[PDB]
Design an enzyme around this catalytic site. Structure first.
Site, PDB file in Angstrom:
ATOM      1  N   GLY A   1       0.733  -1.242   0.000  1.00 34.91           N
ATOM      2  CA  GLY A   1       0.000   0.000   0.000  1.00 34.91           C
ATOM      3  C   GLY A   1       0.763   1.293   0.000  1.00 34.91           C
TER       4      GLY A   1
ATOM      5  N   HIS B   1      -0.385  10.636   5.687  1.00 34.26           N
ATOM      6  CA  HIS B   1       0.212   9.581   6.525  1.00 34.26           C
ATOM      7  C   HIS B   1       1.680   9.423   6.202  1.00 34.26           C
ATOM      8  CE1 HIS B   1      -0.030   5.819   9.032  1.00 34.26           C
ATOM      9  NE2 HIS B   1       1.040   5.510   8.335  1.00 34.26           N
ATOM     10  N   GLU B   2       1.987   9.237   4.931  1.00 33.08           N
ATOM     11  CA  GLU B   2       3.363   8.939   4.590  1.00 33.08           C
ATOM     12  C   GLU B   2       4.274  10.150   4.783  1.00 33.08           C
ATOM     13  OE1 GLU B   2       1.739   5.312   4.347  1.00 33.08           O
ATOM     14  OE2 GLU B   2       3.844   5.866   4.626  1.00 33.08           O
TER      15      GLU B   2
ATOM     16  N   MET C   1       4.718   3.022   1.455  1.00 31.82           N
ATOM     17  CA  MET C   1       5.922   2.913   2.249  1.00 31.82           C
ATOM     18  C   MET C   1       6.622   4.249   2.332  1.00 31.82           C
ATOM     19  SD  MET C   1       7.594   1.190   4.250  1.00 31.82           S
ATOM     20  CE  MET C   1       9.079   1.778   4.990  1.00 31.82           C
ATOM     21  N   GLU C   2       6.861   4.722   3.531  1.00 33.36           N
ATOM     22  CA  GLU C   2       7.351   6.053   3.717  1.00 33.36           C
ATOM     23  C   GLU C   2       8.853   6.196   3.576  1.00 33.36           C
ATOM     24  OE1 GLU C   2       6.103   4.049   5.982  1.00 33.36           O
ATOM     25  OE2 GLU C   2       7.553   3.890   7.557  1.00 33.36           O
TER      26      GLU C   2
ATOM     27  N   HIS D   1       5.494  10.815   8.240  1.00 33.25           N
ATOM     28  CA  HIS D   1       6.666   9.964   8.596  1.00 33.25           C
ATOM     29  C   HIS D   1       8.015  10.556   8.228  1.00 33.25           C
ATOM     30  CE1 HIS D   1       4.936   6.453  10.373  1.00 33.25           C
ATOM     31  NE2 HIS D   1       4.262   6.092   9.293  1.00 33.25           N
TER      32      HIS D   1
END
Ligand SMILES: *[C@@H]1O[C@H](CO)[C@@H](O[C@@H]2O[C@H](CO)[C@@H](O[C@@H]3O[C@H](CO)[C@@H](O)[C@H](O)[C@H]3NC(C)=O)[C@H](O)[C@H]2NC(C)=O)[C@H](O)[C@H]1NC(C)=O
Ligand SMILES: *[C@@H]1O[C@H](CO)[C@@H](O[C@@H]2O[C@H](CO)[C@@H](O[C@@H]3O[C@H](CO)[C@@H](O)[C@H](O)[C@H]3NC(C)=O)[C@H](O)[C@H]2NC(C)=O)[C@H](O)[C@H]1NC(C)=O
Ligand SMILES: *[C@@H]1O[C@H](CO)[C@@H](O[C@@H]2O[C@H](CO)[C@@H](O)[C@H](O)[C@H]2NC(C)=O)[C@H](O)[C@H]1NC(C)=O
Ligand SMILES: *[C@@H]1O[C@H](CO)[C@@H](O[C@@H]2O[C@H](CO)[C@@H](O)[C@H](O)[C@H]2NC(C)=O)[C@H](O)[C@H]1NC(C)=O
Ligand SMILES: *[C@@H]1O[C@H](CO)[C@@H](O[C@@H]2O[C@H](CO)[C@@H](O)[C@H](O)[C@H]2NC(C)=O)[C@H](O)[C@H]1NC(C)=O
Ligand SMILES: *[C@@H]1O[C@H](CO)[C@@H](O[C@@H]2O[C@H](CO)[C@@H](O)[C@H](O)[C@H]2NC(C)=O)[C@H](O)[C@H]1NC(C)=O
Ligand SMILES: *[C@@H]1O[C@H](CO)[C@@H](O[C@@H]2O[C@H](CO)[C@@H](O)[C@H](O)[C@H]2NC(C)=O)[C@H](O)[C@H]1NC(C)=O
Ligand SMILES: *[C@@H]1O[C@H](CO)[C@@H](O[C@@H]2O[C@H](CO)[C@@H](O)[C@H](O)[C@H]2NC(C)=O)[C@H](O)[C@H]1NC(C)=O
Ligand SMILES: *[C@@H]1O[C@H](CO)[C@@H](O)[C@H](O)[C@H]1NC(C)=O
Ligand SMILES: [Zn+2]
EC number: 3.4.11.2
Length: 900
Positions: free
Chosen positions: A284, A320-321, A286-287, A324
């Site tokens: 989905g 969200h990412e 990945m930061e 991070h």
């Protein structure tokens, strides 16, 4: 035991910097194997003497001359000879035995040449295959997360062992290379073979191995530059950039980064942000620092076909990412036992950062339905666990993977939201910045964040706490679950106990604190905020804040900032019921939802009668807002699952027809006969729901609306008049009223459909036919790759089985063809767990339970693939459904008849 047989690396050697050069071979060797080759140099320093070097290494073949590595000392430093070099597969190490000892203070250099499989396994350096027209395309790309960096080059693969990285990619000359940082200049051809180019990147900041990325592809980008010089990009397939699908992502990215720089009160720590949209990336997002990967569908947006909840999905996932890129990447939790803090924090601030990006939306509130009540479902069981694990219990890679769950993400987000509120945001941000400035480019535990948060509370007088930040948060972090708070408004007595949805449950896990919390209680009296209150670690307490008069009422947990549920005595429930039925605006909109969600859970728990839960839905005929309606629909979907084939469904549908009709009239007016959408997100959501809820409960006006719109579309295929928001309800309800004229039309669309999100709505809609023969034809098409993609089959079969007429057709189809474990478990994984859990969701009788024991009987052969013990979950669930239906069918029925 020897140190190469333990799962944790020594702390005698620490890395400083690595040079890593990778060369992916995107064309197989004609055997069928794609490979990559690498060279690596790691420079590390010695802390205490050792005669052994231990470094991670996984599924790599070494081709170094002589030993697996060559070894040197930086500057004038000398280095012992190598005795030997072994691989140890279990603990994923390369071990270098030395004839003598490395020396404290000296830097050494280790050099390796290697290669591995460039597999399509979404781990390490891996390959991804997509289709551009006729042509097969093959990119190289990375997912290091958790423990896979070691699959790509040998490294000190643990999060705290941070270093700088000089990445080079050797790639075919007409492709583009990307990594975490900007490329150093221009690619130049490889001396030995000028069909290949060599792209070098600028040195990384000090960072962890699991946040590395390198990608070789054909992708292109839409670009923007902020005023402060930070170059922003969205990378995608060439055909996708062209259609402008990257535009929404590029538009929100700037604002989001801006919000977080002010929020964290720290600037973006890198020169650029690449964000890349990959086909079939099933992790989905990945930061990776400076190069964040998303599955293509999540990042990309096409506004002519996508609904507002695609749009909301894009912005939040982006937020969200990007959260991070500070908290996680700039300051890094030291080990995987604290993953809840990292992912919880992001899972919470995703809402804030996206609320800013679409300023007139109010995204923030969506954490209540989407995370809090979602995780509450699974944290109110005895099979749950606390957020913290001790470190020394997380060692293996499988153990590390168990950290990535619903509790880590959603309860993490929930207790951190709670924490922030009780402190206040301003205070929360003060200690949050203090943590980043102090720890930037280093490692921490959750105790470090609390200490800094304490420091900020200690530095003021206004906000006072019953205890330290650590003592309070120990109650939410060391023991599993959460309390239910009972309020007797006669005396003002207030209690707490560990809330469990099963009243006969046996909690076997014991807590240091005997399931007592320290709980922040905000309160409203007749619509008016009261003093804030703290319930201490006691079962019972009394306060006059909670004592009511004959004609007063009181309500707890405003805006459901607290991670608990609330039960009051029956008199106060009724006062709240009257209040909502007469002037709903005096109670805030989250708490109109709370009263619903909470009472249904309290009912399941036998702490209120289920009729009380159903009484709390009564006010909804007057309710214009998303969230109350959502609470009722989510809480009632289990009811519908058990009863949609029983005598109860008539009085139930009729009750929802009655409650939703005013809300349908409202949107007929407000939208001006369905021609233009409501202003903000919340109201579009309410609308989508009212139409959905009208149509499935068989209101004549939504039924008519659908038939119309779908007819307008059939006479003009190229000009679709149904807004994207409403398509799944219109498509479903018009295929249901129709027959093969409407079904064969939508299947002509689905076969020609370009976009994934349209095809999903068409597939789901095609399963709402009331013609048995169509559904059985459809089931036939699920196992034909031309018509239905392998990865959509079990989805499609579930959609059919969700249709009540489809239930017995799917069950017969599954049972019969089940044997094709041995074409689709070696044909691919196939998600048997999902299929069964869906096709048997409904089973609620003794007779159906025997049919599952009877199906079971073909144990011989077949097995169950992965979904062995999702078949036991079915049998268990079935028993619990039978038992629930006996206790409730009576009273529910009466309740719906009485109120329709
Ligand atoms: C990790 O990779 C770094 C980048 O490739 C290496 O640093 C580079 O090393 C080169 C020498 O190894 C230097 O380039 C030129 O080298 C020639 C030798 O033929 C010299 O005469 C020149 O002094 C030099 N060219 C110029 C114009 O000065 C680079 O200076 C240097 N690049 C950097 C630091 O960015 C590291 O050596 C390598 N690490 C290890 C451990 O091997
Ligand atoms: C990393 O090393 C692995 C183990 O050394 C390699 O896997 C082995 O490759 C062998 C030779 O390349 C294969 O052996 C046989 O080769 C013949 C000759 O053409 C094939 O037809 C046979 O099918 C094959 N034998 C069998 C039993 O299949 C093996 O496939 C394999 N052997 C072992 C013991 O694992 C990897 O090739 C290598 N990978 C990379 C990316 O470098
Ligand atoms: C990666 O590249 C960086 C910078 O280009 C290198 O950092 C230099 O290291 C040398 C040798 O130790 C020092 O004398 C310089 O002072 C450093 N330069 C800068 C700009 O920081 C780093 O050494 C390279 N990594 C490896 C593993 O060789
Ligand atoms: C990059 O170069 C390669 C070098 O051959 C191109 O590969 C060919 O592309 C054409 C047209 O798309 C196909 O008909 C051939 O079958 C391809 N050959 C191979 C071996 O794959 C490639 O398409 C180029 N692409 C870009 C975007 O520059
Ligand atoms: C992202 O922003 C761009 C502009 O910054 C938006 O593009 C608009 O679309 C029209 C279509 O006729 C273009 O001619 C203009 O360049 C743009 N501006 C306006 C005000 O319409 C784009 O639509 C945005 N995308 C999203 C999804 O928000
Ligand atoms: C993990 O982080 C700690 C800080 O959280 C690092 O220790 C700090 O290191 C700098 C230089 O070593 C010193 O000035 C401080 O005294 C250290 N703080 C301490 C000891 O708390 C630590 O080195 C990092 N660990 C690893 C493996 O890199
Ligand atoms: C509210 O709080 C107190 C508990 O501290 C309860 O009052 C006590 O009730 C018991 C009856 O078993 C007596 O032994 C005590 O002497 C009572 N103390 C009083 C009246 O001060 C009271 O019952 C609680 N109310 C509830 C649960 O509704
Ligand atoms: C509970 O949440 C609502 C939003 O759901 C809050 O109401 C907003 O408050 C801000 C500033 O305090 C105002 O600018 C807005 O006009 C309000 N928005 C809406 C949509 O009402 C409310 O403050 C929250 N209450 C508490 C006590 O936290
Ligand atoms: C309901 O009460 C609110 C706030 O106290 C007030 O503004 C509103 O006009 C009232 N509505 C009615 C219909 O009485
Ligand atoms: Zn995350």
């Amino acid at each position: 035991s020897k140190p190469w047989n333990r799962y944790r690396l020594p702390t005698t050697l620490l890395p400083d910097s690595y040079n890593v050069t990778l060369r992916p071979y995107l064309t197989p060797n004609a055997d069928g194997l794609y490979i990559f080759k690498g060279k690596s140099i790691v420079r590390f320093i010695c802390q205490e003497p050792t005669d052994v070097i231990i470094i991670h290494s996984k599924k790599l073949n070494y081709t170094t001359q002589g030993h697996m590595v060559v070894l040197r000392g930086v500057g004038d430093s000398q280095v012992p000879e190598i005795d030997r070099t072994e691989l140890v597969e279990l603990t994923e190490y390369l071990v270098v035995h030395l004839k003598g000892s490395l020396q404290p203070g000296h830097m050494y250099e280790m050099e390796s040449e290697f290669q591995g499989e460039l597999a399509d396994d979404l781990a390490g350096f891996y390959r991804s295959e997509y289709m551009e027209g006729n042509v097969k395309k093959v990119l190289a790309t990375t997912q290091m997360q958790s423990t896979d960096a070691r699959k790509s080059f040998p490294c000190f693969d643990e999060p705290a062992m941070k270093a700088t990285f000089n990445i080079t990619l050797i790639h075919p000359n007409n492709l583009t290379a990307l990594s975490n940082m900007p490329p150093k200049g221009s690619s130049t051809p490889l001396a030995e073979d000028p069909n290949w180019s060599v792209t070098e990147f600028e040195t990384t900041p000090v960072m962890s191995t699991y946040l590395l990325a390198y990608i070789v592809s054909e992708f292109q980008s839409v670009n923007e530059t902020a005023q402060n010089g930070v170059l922003i990009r969205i990378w995608a397939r060439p055909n996708a950039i062209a259609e402008g699908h990257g535009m929404y992502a590029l538009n929100v990215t700037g604002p989001i980064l801006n919000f977080f720089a002010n929020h964290y009160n720290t600037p973006y720590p890198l020169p650029k942000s690449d964000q890349i949209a990959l086909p079939d990336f099933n992790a989905g997002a990945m930061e990776n620092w400076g190069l964040v990967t998303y599955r293509e569908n999540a990042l990309l947006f096409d506004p002519q076909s996508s609904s507002i909840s695609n749009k909301e999905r894009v912005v939040t996932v982006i937020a969200h990412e990007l959260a991070h890129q500070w908290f996680g990447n700039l300051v890094t939790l030291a080990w995987w036992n604290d993953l809840w803090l990292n992912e919880g924090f992001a899972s919470y601030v995703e809402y804030l950062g996206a609320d800013h990006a679409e300023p007139t939306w109010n995204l923030k509130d969506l954490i209540v339905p989407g995370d809090v009540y979602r995780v509450m479902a699974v944290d109110a069981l005895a099979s749950s666990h606390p957020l913290t694990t001790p470190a020394e219990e997380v060692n293996t890679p499988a153990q590390i993977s168990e950290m990535f769950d619903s509790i880590s993400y959603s309860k993490g987000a929930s207790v951190i939201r709670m924490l922030s509120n009780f402190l206040t945001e301003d205070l929360f941000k003060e200690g949050l910045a203090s943590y980043l400035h102090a720890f930037a480019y280093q490692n921490t535990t959750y105790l470090d964040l609390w200490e800094h948060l304490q420091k900020a509370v200690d530095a003021q007088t206004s906000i006072r706490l019953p205890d330290t930040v650590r003592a309070i948060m120990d109650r939410w972090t060391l023991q599993m679950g959460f309390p239910v708070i009972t309020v007797d408004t006669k005396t003002g007595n207030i209690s707490q106990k560990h809330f469990l949805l099963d009243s006969e449950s046996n909690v076997t896990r014991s807590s240091a604190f005997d399931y007592l919390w320290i709980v922040p209680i905000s309160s409203i009296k007749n619509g008016v905020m009261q003093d804030h209150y703290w319930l201490r670690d006691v079962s019972q307490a009394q306060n006059d804040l909670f004592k009511t008069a004959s004609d007063d009422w009181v309500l707890l947990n405003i805006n459901v900032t607290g991670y608990f549920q609330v039960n009051y005595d029956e008199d106060n429930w009724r006062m709240i019921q009257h209040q909502l039925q007469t002037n709903l605006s005096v109670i805030p909109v989250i708490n109109r939802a709370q009263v619903i969600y909470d009472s249904f859970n309290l009912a399941t728990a036998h702490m209120v009668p289920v009729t009380l839960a159903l009484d709390n839905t009564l006010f909804l005929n007057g309710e214009k807002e998303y969230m109350p309606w959502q609470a009722a629909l989510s809480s009632l979907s289990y009811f519908s699952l058990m009863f949609d084939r029983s005598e109860v469904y008539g009085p139930m549908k009729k009750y929802l027809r009655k409650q939703v009709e005013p809300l349908f009239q409202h949107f007929e007016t407000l939208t001006k006969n369905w021609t233009e959408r409501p202003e903000n997100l919340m109201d579009q959501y309410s609308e989508i729901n009212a139409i959905s809820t009208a149509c499935s409960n068989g209101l004549p006006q939504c039924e008519n609306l659908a038939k119309t719109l779908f007819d307008q579309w059939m006479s003009d295929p190229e000009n679709n008049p149904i807004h994207p928001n409403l398509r799944s309800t219109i498509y479903c309800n018009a295929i249901a009223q129709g027959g093969q004229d409407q079904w064969d039309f939508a299947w002509g669309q689905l076969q020609q459909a370009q976009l994934v999100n349209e095809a999903d709505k068409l597939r789901s809609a095609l399963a709402c036919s009331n013609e048995v023969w169509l559904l059985n034809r459809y089931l036939g098409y699920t196992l034909n790759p031309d018509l239905i993609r392998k990865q959509d089959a079990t989805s499609t079969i579930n959609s059919i089985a969700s249709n009540v007429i489809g239930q017995p057709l799917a069950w017969d189809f599954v049972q019969s063809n089940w044997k094709k474990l041995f074409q689709d478990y070696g044909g691919g994984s196939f998600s048997f767990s999902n299929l069964i859990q869906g096709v048997t969701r409904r089973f609620s009788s003794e007779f159906e339970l025997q049919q599952l024991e009877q199906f079971k009987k073909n144990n011989m052969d077949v097995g169950f693939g992965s979904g062995t013990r999702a078949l036991e979950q079915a049998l268990e669930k079935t028993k619990a459904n039978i038992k629930w239906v006996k206790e409730n069918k009576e009273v529910v029925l009466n309740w719906f008849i009485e109120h329709s």
